Amino acid sequence: SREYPTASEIPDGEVRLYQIADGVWSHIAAQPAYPSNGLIVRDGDELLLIDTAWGAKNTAALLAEIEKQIGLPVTRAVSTHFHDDRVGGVDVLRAAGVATYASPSTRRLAKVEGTEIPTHSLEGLSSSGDAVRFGPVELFYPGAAHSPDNLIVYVPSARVLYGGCAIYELSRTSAGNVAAADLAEWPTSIERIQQHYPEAQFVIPGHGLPGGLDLLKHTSDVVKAHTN
Amino acid sequence: EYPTASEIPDGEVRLYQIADGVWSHIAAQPLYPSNGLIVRDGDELLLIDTAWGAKNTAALLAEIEKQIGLPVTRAVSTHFHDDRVGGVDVLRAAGVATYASPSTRRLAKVEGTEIPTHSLEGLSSSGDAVRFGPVELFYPGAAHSPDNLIVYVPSARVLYGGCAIYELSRTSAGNVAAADLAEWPTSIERIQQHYPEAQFVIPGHGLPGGLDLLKHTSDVVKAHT
Ligand SMILES: [Zn+2]
Ligand SMILES: [Zn+2]
């Protein structure tokens, strides 16, 4: 029955609880779309959540605050309406504010699984074998591999080849994610990388230790071995 | 020695200088793209595939500023990887079952976002009311959004309207992008009808009040015309 928390004065990543009545709380979080208030209702010996705190950060803090102050498990949650509170790496860069660049293929692929995010189009990379200059690097589309849209980045000044998830480290002996991968085209796409960058001295995989051009041959062998 | 990602503490990002103006950035994720590139562009920096997640990306930017001291002006994504997570995704990963009306989940589909797992039936018509656990769900009709629900806690006579209800201090309509300004006052009337016994009303933002918040909200929306 005291001072209700003003959302703007709650630090980033923190959430306040306000008990309205027995087994009824309101949770308040910073509101950087302005919904700062939500509800916590006791459900027997469990808790029902109404409109969780905005964002992944605040929701995690909400659950932690609930456990600390109430000590009852949150088993169910209701969204009263739709609000896109998703934040990723590109969103943090956008607010930095760094301009993010992506191929049309990548952007169109983002649409099917969630975007609306402003990005700039990287033209001239729609066909396998295409290569364009972007600032201090060269962008290369080898074709489908780990994903239908994966690009390769080469740094000519240092002869450094970054293959992303399309390239494995030496210690990786079996194919990983593969869900969005074209296992058939993957070795062919690697061949295009090998032919277009024979001068590469430093090859960086998506995960793990860097190596030489042997990473390309290694990745192709692992993917091929993922057959029948 | 090049950092093995599994031996990097949680929430930390490493920078490995390969050559002049060329760094790799390594983040931990054994639970998963761990490597990325930083290439010097004149007196600026070009970022290749920022670290996975909002937290690591922020730590990456901080580490870049601390160690290199040059501004990141552009960033390239080599491929789409969904590290964009919201509240529903955290709830789902923590073992919390998420619920929403078919209308809300249908709206969720049209944006490719994270759909609440289970459907809340019996709320497709204006005036509909169902019980869900310790609360009553009420669909007043279109207001702040086509799908907005009202939550009533009968044991405490507490009314929660979400963004469909303003606090007293709000004298102008805010986020009204998906709002039906014409139906909003009518939908509010239905709320007033179904819950005249409500003692505490919680707005989507700001201080709680009584049933006067309903009247107040309708006045603000009408004044927007
Ligand atoms: Zn809201
Ligand atoms: Zn990938």
Residue numbers in the entry:
A (entry chain A): 30 to 61, 66 to 261
B (entry chain B): 32 to 62, 67 to 260
Article passage:
Having established that protein stability does not constrain the evolvability of the enzymes, we sought a molecular explanation by solving the crystal structures of the R10 variants of the NDM1 and VIM2 trajectories, allowing us to compare them with the previously published wild-type structures. For VIM2, we were only able to crystallize the dimeric fraction of VIM2-R10. This dimer reveals an unprecedented structural rearrangement: a full half of the structure exhibits a symmetrical domain-swapping between the two subunits. Besides domain swapping, the major structural rearrangement occurring between VIM2-WT and VIM2-R10 involves the reorganization of loop 3 resulting in its disorder in VIM2-R10, which is most likely caused by six mutations within and next to loop 3. Four out of these six loop 3 mutations have accumulated by R5; thus, we speculate that these mutations and the loop rearrangement were the major cause of the ~25 fold increase in catalytic efficiency for PMH in VIM2-R10, compared to the wildtype. The monomeric VIM2-WT, however, evolved to exist in an equilibrium between monomer and dimer by VIM2-R10. We isolated monomeric and dimeric states, respectively, using size-exclusion chromatography, and determined their kinetic parameters. The catalytic efficiency of the dimeric state for PMH is eightfold lower compared to the monomeric state (kcat/KM = 510 and 60 M−1s−1 for the monomer vs. dimer, respectively), indicating that the dimer formation may be associated with an overall increase in solubility, rather than catalytic efficiency along the VIM2 trajectory. By contrast, the catalytic efficiency of VIM2 stagnated at round 6, with only a ~ 25 fold increase in kcat/KM overall (VIM2-R10 compared to the wild-type). The subsequent PMH fitness improvements resulted from increasing soluble expression, from 40% to 70%.
